Design an enzyme around this catalytic site. Structure first.
Site, PDB file in Angstrom:
ATOM      1  N   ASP A 198      12.253  28.872  59.124  1.00  0.00           N
ATOM      2  CA  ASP A 198      13.027  29.192  60.351  1.00  0.00           C
ATOM      3  C   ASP A 198      14.495  29.486  60.020  1.00  0.00           C
ATOM      4  O   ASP A 198      15.114  28.781  59.200  1.00  0.00           O
ATOM      5  CB  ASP A 198      12.912  28.055  61.360  1.00  0.00           C
ATOM      6  CG  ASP A 198      13.655  28.304  62.652  1.00  0.00           C
ATOM      7  OD1 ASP A 198      13.088  29.002  63.492  1.00  0.00           O
ATOM      8  OD2 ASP A 198      14.789  27.782  62.796  1.00  0.00           O
ATOM      9  N   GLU A 253       5.045  24.775  42.011  1.00  0.00           N
ATOM     10  CA  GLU A 253       4.257  23.601  41.526  1.00  0.00           C
ATOM     11  C   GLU A 253       2.824  23.646  42.075  1.00  0.00           C
ATOM     12  O   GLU A 253       2.011  22.814  41.665  1.00  0.00           O
ATOM     13  CB  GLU A 253       4.886  22.271  41.936  1.00  0.00           C
ATOM     14  CG  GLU A 253       6.145  21.954  41.177  1.00  0.00           C
ATOM     15  CD  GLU A 253       6.847  20.700  41.645  1.00  0.00           C
ATOM     16  OE1 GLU A 253       6.229  19.604  41.556  1.00  0.00           O
ATOM     17  OE2 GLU A 253       8.014  20.820  42.101  1.00  0.00           O
TER      18      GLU A 253
END
Length: 520
Positions: A198, A253
């Protein structure tokens, strides 16, 4: 060849997708039941707008617990089920992440506002009043009034780019940075495939608290104090990209993650490329080029696309014609007379642009803006700034599934009305109608997917002449000529190719009103 590069993403507004318990509000079990719709459409992913614990002042964008589901929408059990159903249907799942602010009811702010010495004193943006009581700077809220509010708990102002209920996070503070990264990790360990981030350019303000300068007169009528000033210092700090690196570092990751940022303002393209550069930042970003456009012009499309050349470290843009932040595009760009033909030009054009298609719920059915009276408003922004509002309530109407009393939303008393003009456009009715926009959108999505020049190709030419647009794109041996008539005047095109797709009576040499053709 990442899965997200060239994807179509279907944005769900969970308050209005499907109310599965009859309270008037959409919910996660509702979304679970309806996911096959999105799969059958051929969208690659969903993006779920906020469903986290929230007082709902900005209807979920004011988060009070970043790591739980609001009771309005169900539970964390229900979110894991939407993930598992989606993955079973081959849908990737994106969730909204809101890092520029929290609710005032968030535990961090309750600690921060408590006094000046607490461990979270500095996780938000606190400043003393001027000696005369004035706010610390001249910054103005996106939603009307000033961007600062008094808190007598501290004897200080706190910054909020949006509602007073959305105090700005101080992401200059490395402890806050670490905290929101740990929130993202929580969501990644639940099998999420990535994020819509956002208002990412609102993450960081100017520590000097310098006054914004007056705005030149771009005579769009000024609607609110915010429109008077350039957003120089309230946002867009040079240090946001360094923070975004830690995000990409985190998403690296996990396997096959996609990030797209919302990026606001007219200062837009510079922060979009900075937010997406190389492989160290976000994958994608979208701006308001189409969201805030009064008209769909060839010059606006060749303007927008020109900003994103295929250079080797540049980002991959995302495109949104409409969403929860702007009136339904068919209510902006065309007469009722032209609507039927325009809806398919517009849909085919979204699928022909180099970048990702952000399809918003209802856009595949051609839902129109519902006009919301002043008595019936929900969005605080509109009450404050009437009649010169952002018109977001009328964009957020319940999704119509069938032509039943509740239109199959699940409530004869929905939180907003369906709209008499959207009732005949229900998914059921469009599954009976062979020339439906639902069936056309499927076809547009299938033609992008199967054609590597539409799916990802370079824009080798963008040509604009009055109402005619021509996109020449190209990849994997393929060269497509995409011709669009954004006008009601029949236009005459020298092709010498094969029609992949022709609509609204388009021919290789002639384009009647709102006709388009893809030539190979």
């Amino acid at each position: 060849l990442p899965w997200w590069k060239g994807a179509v993403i279907y944005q769900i507004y969970p308050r209005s997708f499907m109310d599965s318990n009859g309270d008037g509000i959409g919910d996660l079990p509702g979304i679970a039941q309806r996911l096959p719709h999105i799969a059958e459409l051929g969208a690659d992913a969903i993006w779920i707008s906020p469903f986290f614990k929230s007082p709902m002042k900005d209807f979920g964008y004011d988060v009070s617990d970043y790591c739980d589901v609001d009771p309005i929408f169900g539970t964390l059990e229900d979110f894991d089920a939407v993930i598992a159903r989606s993955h079973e249907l081959g849908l990737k799942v994106l969730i909204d992440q809101v890092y520029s602010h929290t609710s005032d009811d968030h535990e961090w702010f309750a600690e921060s506002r408590s006094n000046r010495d607490n461990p979270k004193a500095e996780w938000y943006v606190w400043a003393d009043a001027k000696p005369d009581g004035s706010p610390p700077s001249n910054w103005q809220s996106v939603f009307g009034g000033p961007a600062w509010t008094w808190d007598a708990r501290r004897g200080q102002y706190y910054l909020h780019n949006f509602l007073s209920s959305q105090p700005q996070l101080n992401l200059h503070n490395r402890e806050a940075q670490q905290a929101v990264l740990d929130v993202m990790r929580f969501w990644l360990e639940r099998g999420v495939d990535g994020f819509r981030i956002d208002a990412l350019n609102f993450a960081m303000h100017d520590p000097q608290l310098r006054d914004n300068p007056p705005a030149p007169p771009t005579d769009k009528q000024r609607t609110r104090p915010f429109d008077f000033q350039l957003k120089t210092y309230n946002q867009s700090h040079a240090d946001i990209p360094a923070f975004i690196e830690r995000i990409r570092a985190l998403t690296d990751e996990f396997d096959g993650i996609f990030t797209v940022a919302e990026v606001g303002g007219d200062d837009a393209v510079r922060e979009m490329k900075a937010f997406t550069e190389g492989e160290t930042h976000l994958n994608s970003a979208y701006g308001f080029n189409f969201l805030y456009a009064e008209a769909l012009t060839p010059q606006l499309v060749c303007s927008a696309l020109a900003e994103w050349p295929e250079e080797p470290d540049l980002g991959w843009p995302s495109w949104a014609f409409e969403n929860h932040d702007a009136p339904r595009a068919l209510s902006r760009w065309c007469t009722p007379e032209d609507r039927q033909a325009f809806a398919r030009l517009k849909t085919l054009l979204l699928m022909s642009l180099r970048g990702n298609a952000i399809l918003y719920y209802g856009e595949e059915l051609g839902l129109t803006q519902v006009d919301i009276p002043f008595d019936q408003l929900h969005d605080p922004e509109a009450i404050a700034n009437w009649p010169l509002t952002l018109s977001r309530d009328g964009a957020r109407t319940p999704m119509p599934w069938d032509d039943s009393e509740c239109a199959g939303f699940g409530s004869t008393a929905p939180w907003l009305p369906v709209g008499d003009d959207n009732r005949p456009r229900s998914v059921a009715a469009q599954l009976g109608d062979a020339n439906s926009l639902l069936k056309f959108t499927r076809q547009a999505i299938a033609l992008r997917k199967a054609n590597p020049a539409l799916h990802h190709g370079h824009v080798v030419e963008c040509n604009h002449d009055g109402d005619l647009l021509e996109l020449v794109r190209e990849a994997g041996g393929q060269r497509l000529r995409c011709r669009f008539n954004l006008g009601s005047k029949p236009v005459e095109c020298d092709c010498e190719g094969r029609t992949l797709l022709a609509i609204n009576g388009a021919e290789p040499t002639a384009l009647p009103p709102f006709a388009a053709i893809i030539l190979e």
